[PDB]
């Protein structure tokens, strides 16, 4: 297949350097200009840099000029992005892409899967898991809500399931928020029949691979 | 620079109805040498790369269904979806590829428009386990509402809270086209212990007056 495969993303401290790589296959990479494009959290796609097919010229987004260098090794069908003096606002998913500058005929585009770059001085930390207990004033014969608060972890992601994946209906696992501490927090809730409280057991299963933490937490009426 | 501006920033379209997205370039992208507009439209869904829909402003890419069409010339372009399908929910970008700095527009988020649904609201006190840690998180859930617009207001002993909450919203639900929202109020244990009444007040166009959920610390 025509494809691009990115590698090199991870957590990097502000002011440090990180190199991304993009391995091309299935098409004549050395015939095309190539780009990096990024998407920061809560923001839109943002073009970052362009390099000519033969490496003879480059073009940069103003906010990375002088800090980022796009380069390529056609002998290895590989594109690079050297990121120096990294800043918090460089945090993003980074894509390599062919794009359409200079197209004529036999037109195609191709994008990599993306690689995540997180610019942070935070240390790896597993979450604390706290119950969101169903209210004692839950409407009889109605609907109750309960959940788990997954607080103060780094880096993303955590995975949350309920009853080992057997409970999926009515579950809402929210996007994490980045707290001022530099640690993430999220909640996972589920609505269930109030009549099921007590009878049915509710357990949130929370895994955070970077910290090797795997918790099954039972949530009970108080 | 050729800068790209899209309008609207978000669009709600009923299933099967027409969606129109506009895009303006700050300079013309029509080449005088080949009379083509260097204008593309991309579709972008979460957790996957963008997909090319349209290039040369109106040339539909292979595999793209004929309900997508691009029009316009020079500086004014439109993407039309003639009959919205559930799989068309996505952010749509125009992009110019005329220059060596081929900027994208800001994107237009297209969602399904459905009937109004007021949120069901739930408030959760901090767990005793967390309090033994020095921090108190108070959580307010707004469940399965539509439209997305909603305001959460925290009150502690009737005092309006400002700057000590964060919220998060789910993606549109694939089954019922609603949203849900979580708001977390964070206080030190010391501050949490000074006050009695903790309240989440919710405003939404489906609610004729704001709904407040509350608890008294220690009941």
């Amino acid at each position: 297949q025509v494809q691009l495969v990115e590698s090199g993303g991870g957590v990097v401290q502000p002011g440090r350097s990180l190199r991304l790589s993009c391995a091309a296959s299935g098409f004549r990479f050395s015939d095309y200009g190539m780009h990096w494009v990024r998407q920061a959290p809560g923001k839109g796609l943002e073009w970052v840099a362009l390099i000519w097919y033969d490496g003879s010229n480059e073009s940069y987004l103003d906010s990375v000029k002088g800090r980022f260098t796009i380069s390529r090794d056609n002998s290895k069908n590989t594109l690079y992005l050297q990121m120096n003096n990294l800043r918090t606002e460089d945090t993003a998913v980074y894509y390599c892409a062919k794009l359409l500058v200079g197209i004529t005929t036999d037109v195609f585009d191709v994008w990599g899967q993306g690689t995540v770059v997180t610019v942070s001085s935070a240390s790896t930390k597993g979450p604390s898991v706290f119950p969101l207990a169903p209210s004692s004033k839950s409407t009889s014969g109605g609907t109750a809500a309960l959940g788990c608060l997954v607080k103060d972890y780094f880096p993303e992601p955590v995975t949350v399931s309920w009853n080992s994946g057997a409970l999926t209906s009515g579950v809402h696992t929210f996007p994490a928020v980045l707290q001022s501490s530099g640690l993430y927090s999220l909640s996972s809730v589920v609505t269930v029949p109030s009549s099921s409280l007590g009878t049915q057991t509710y357990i949130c299963n929370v895994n955070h691979k970077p910290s090797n933490t795997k918790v099954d937490k039972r949530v009970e009426p108080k | 620079d050729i800068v790209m501006t899209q309008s609207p920033d978000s669009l709600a379209v009923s299933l099967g109805e027409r969606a129109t997205i506009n895009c303006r370039s700050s300079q013309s992208v029509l080449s005088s040498s080949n009379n083509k507009n260097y204008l593309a439209w991309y579709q972008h869904k979460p957790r996957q790369p963008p997909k090319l829909l349209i290039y040369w402003a109106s040339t539909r890419e292979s595999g793209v269904p004929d309900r997508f069409s691009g029009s316009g010339s020079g500086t004014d372009f439109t993407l039309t979806i003639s009959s919205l399908q559930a799989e068309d929910v996505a952010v749509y970008y125009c992009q110019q590829y005329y220059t060596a700095s081929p900027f994208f527009g800001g994107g237009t988020k297209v969602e399904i428009k459905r009937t109004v649904a007021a949120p069901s609201v739930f408030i959760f006190p901090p767990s005793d386990e967390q309090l033994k840690s020095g921090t108190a998180s108070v959580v307010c859930l707004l469940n399965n509402f539509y439209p997305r617009e909603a305001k959460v207001q925290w009150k502690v002993d009737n005092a309006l809270q400002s700057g000590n909450s964060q919220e998060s919203v789910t993606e549109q639900d694939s089954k019922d086209s609603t949203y849900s929202l979580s708001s977390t109020l964070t206080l030190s244990k010391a501050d949490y212990e000074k006050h009695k009444v903790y309240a989440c007040e919710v405003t939404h166009q489906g609610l004729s007056s704001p709904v407040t959920k509350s608890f008294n610390r220690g009941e």
Binding site: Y32, G33, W52, Y53, N57 | -
Partner: peptide
Amino acid sequence: NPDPNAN
């Protein structure tokens, strides 16, 4: 109106 591609 650049062309960064081979010719």
